[PDB]
């Protein structure tokens, strides 16, 4: 309701705010922080949208088809995507992370290099991005000035010192073995899944992104309204174990269940604020 400000210094003035929403029906807490930059020297205004918050993984063994079949639902993807409309004159200047990456933990410090510039570092005062993603990759979805977005999808994973196993893993005897607790163990199918204790925390607790898009709009721009869609989603897979005769045999079905959680925020470039 105020839009808080700092400034650094007689060049710029950082109008900063935060916009949270808790999508209980999709198990997501979207946290969207924003920072307006007003470097009078440079000709354009910079908006840096930091998309924090947490998507719950929603790993779940969901039914029992007798004691020889059972299905597991697990998160094989997470996304966050920003996207301006086709007609609009604002442009996506910069974004972080800038490349795709494996590393367990991403981390970089964003600062403003007094030139309409905002660059990242991995080792002048500003805040820093970090997010952990064990057993996952981060893929930069094909960005342009209109649209940018990340998808942290499942990479591979060890299973009780065997493995590693991925979504496209296959053994003729045992099939796919991602969350197969035992191989030829006589028990209820539903009891023979891998405890979420023994896999990635992104599967249970879930993902918590810390990405940063930055948008530029010119002071001279004839229309200072600016709408943008911020879509968090969760792709989930279907993994069924079933007894064969002599042993167990699992199998994955890619991308059964999706959870597109779209919000759309308005940006007053003049009064330098943002709200859903």
């Amino acid at each position, epitope marked *: 309701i105020k839009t808080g400000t700092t400034d650094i210094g007689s060049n710029t003035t950082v109008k900063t705010g935060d916009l949270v929403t808790y999508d*209980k*029906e*999709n*198990g997501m807490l979207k946290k969207v922080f924003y920072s307006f930059i007003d470097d009078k020297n440079h000709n354009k205004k910079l908006l840096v949208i930091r998309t924090k918050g947490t998507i719950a993984g*929603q*790993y*779940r*063994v*969901y*039914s*029992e*088809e*007798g004691a020889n079949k059972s*299905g597991l*639902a697990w998160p094989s993807a997470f996304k966050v995507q920003l996207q301006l409309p086709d007609n609009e004159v604002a442009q996506i200047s910069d974004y972080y992370p800038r490349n795709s990456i494996d590393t367990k933990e991403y981390m970089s410090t964003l600062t403003y290099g007094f030139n309409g510039n905002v660059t990242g570092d991995d080792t002048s005062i500003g805040h820093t991005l970090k997010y952990v993603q064990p057993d996952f990759k981060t893929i930069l979805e094909s960005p342009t000035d209109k649209k940018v977005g990340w998808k942290v999808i499942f990479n591979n994973m060890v299973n009780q010192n065997w493995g590693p196993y991925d979504r496209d893993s296959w053994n003729p005897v045992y099939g796919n073995q991602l969350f197969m607790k035992t191989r030829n163990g006589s028990m*209820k199918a*539903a*009891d023979n899944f891998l405890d*979420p204790n023994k896999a990635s925390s992104l599967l*249970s607790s879930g993902f918590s992104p810390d990405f940063a898009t930055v948008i530029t709009m010119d002071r001279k721009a004839s229309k200072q309204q600016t709408n943008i869609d911020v879509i968090y989603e969760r792709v*989930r897979d279907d993994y069924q174990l079933h007894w064969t005769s002599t042993n167990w045999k699992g199998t994955n079905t890619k991308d059964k*269940w999706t959870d597109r959680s779209s919000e759309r925020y308005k940006i007053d470039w003049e009064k330098e604020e943002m709200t859903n």
Partner: antibody, heavy 125, light 109 residues
Framework: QVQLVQSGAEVKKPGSSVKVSCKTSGGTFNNVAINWVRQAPGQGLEWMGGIIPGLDTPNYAQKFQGRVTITADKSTTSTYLELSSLRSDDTAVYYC??????????????????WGQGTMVTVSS | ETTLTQSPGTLSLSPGERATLSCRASQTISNNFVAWYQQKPGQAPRLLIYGASTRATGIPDRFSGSGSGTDFTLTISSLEPEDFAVYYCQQYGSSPYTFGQGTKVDIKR
């Protein structure tokens, strides 16, 4: 004030099929499992099936042999319990019972926390 | 199935006295997941205890769960007028999610 409100009582000719509904009032809907439990007059309770709306994954009791078939619906925020080839011995109260919405649930269901009023199905020729 | 079987049949006691309902399983119910419901005439049942020992929201300390292996037991610390009803144990781990037959408590004259 999260709450369930089931359909009106009914009476069905034996051989026909019934389906009672159960709408979720207050509170969330999607990944919280709704079960159906049934009670004959002055009798024990009997689990029949459940459904996890979001996944739309039904969980059926195997004794019933798929006569029982359960579904969910977002527009109505409700579940349905259909039962085919009704008989004299089905005449019972039919409660829907939403599970307890616990933090880290990775199993189907767990502990039937809030129940509807029950629907009376009374199969008689 | 994993068939529970409660005891005793009826429980003829007066208020102030403690009543200990027992419930025993075919096989281990895991131990995760065993609930106790109280049903009064005409109404639906009412979740008292879950998991095994921890009690559902709003239930008074009077009601108390405990057990292990294949024997679980609900204890009413000090029976109160309203507590005289039927009591149903259940396991909700393995499908089919079996219910006990039911033990009734009964004001004693």
């Amino acid at each position: 004030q999260v709450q369930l409100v089931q359909s009106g009582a009914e009476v069905k000719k034996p051989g026909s099929s019934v389906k009672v509904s159960c709408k979720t009032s207050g509170g969330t809907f999607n990944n919280v499992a709704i079960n159906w439990v049934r009670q004959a007059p002055g009798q024990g309770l009997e689990w029949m099936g459940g459904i996890i709306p979001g996944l739309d994954t039904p969980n059926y009791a195997q004794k019933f042999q798929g006569r029982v078939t359960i579904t969910a619906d977002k527009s109505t925020t409700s579940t349905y319990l259909e039962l085919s080839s009704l008989r004299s011995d089905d005449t019972a109260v039919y409660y829907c019972a939403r599970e307890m919405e616990v933090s880290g649930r990775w199993r189907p269901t767990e502990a039937f926390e809030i129940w509807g009023q029950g629907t009376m199905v009374t199969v008689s020729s | 199935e994993t068939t529970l079987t409660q005891s005793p049949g009826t429980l003829s006691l007066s208020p102030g006295e403690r009543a200990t309902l027992s419930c025993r399983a075919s096989q281990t119910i895991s131990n995760n997941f065993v609930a106790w419901y109280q049903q009064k005439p005409g109404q639906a049942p009412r979740l008292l205890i879950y998991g095994a020992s921890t009690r559902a929201t709003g239930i008074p300390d009077r009601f108390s769960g405990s057990g292990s292996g294949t024997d679980f037991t609900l204890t009413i610390s000090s029976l109160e007028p309203e507590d005289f009803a039927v009591y149903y144990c259940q396991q909700y781990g393995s499908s089919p999610y079996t219910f006990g037959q039911g033990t009734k408590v009964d004001i004693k004259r």
